[PDB]
Write a protein that binds this ligand. Sequence first.
Ligand SMILES: CCCCCCCCCCCCCCCC(=O)SCCNC(=O)CCNC(=O)[C@H](O)C(C)(C)COP(=O)(O)OP(=O)(O)OC[C@H]1O[C@@H](n2cnc3c(N)ncnc32)[C@H](O)[C@@H]1OP(=O)(O)O
Length: 91
Amino acid sequence: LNCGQVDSKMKPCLTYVQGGPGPSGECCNGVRDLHNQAQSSGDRQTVCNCLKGIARGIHNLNLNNAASIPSKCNVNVPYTISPDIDCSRIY
Ligand SMILES: CCCCCCCCCCCCCCCC(=O)SCCNC(=O)CCNC(=O)[C@H](O)C(C)(C)COP(=O)(O)OP(=O)(O)OC[C@H]1O[C@@H](n2cnc3c(N)ncnc32)[C@H](O)[C@@H]1OP(=O)(O)O
């Protein structure tokens, strides 16, 4: 009960970076949302670890696309933006 939202809100964005059925629309809002939504108990810092764990092995991390999520999805948060994302460099 912590890394559920994770997906509920960014499924289309992780799909996007590993090469699946995203980011279309649901990602940008899911994203803008998450930036502003994952501010309950620090969620994105929890998310980080969830990301890290799948990332761990994943499919085709197109980090360029990932680092392009924010620019593409008007969510302007510095959010670390990296393969094995560290929770300590998020905002
Ligand atoms: C504000 C963000 C935007 C910043 C600016 C843009 C730049 C962003 C740059 C980084 C890009 C990537 C960002 C990712 C953000 C996310 O948080 S998306 C998370 C990573 N995505 C995935 O892992 C997608 C692939 N999905 C799975 O591996 C699996 O389907 C998941 C883990 C999503 C779970 O599936 P569900 O089946 O939907 O889970 P369920 O609804 O039953 O229940 C949730 C609960 O169960 C755990 N669970 C279930 N099944 C799994 C599997 N197979 N593996 C792991 N965990 C599983 C979930 O962890 C969750 O745990 P709770 O603690 O919430 O109970």
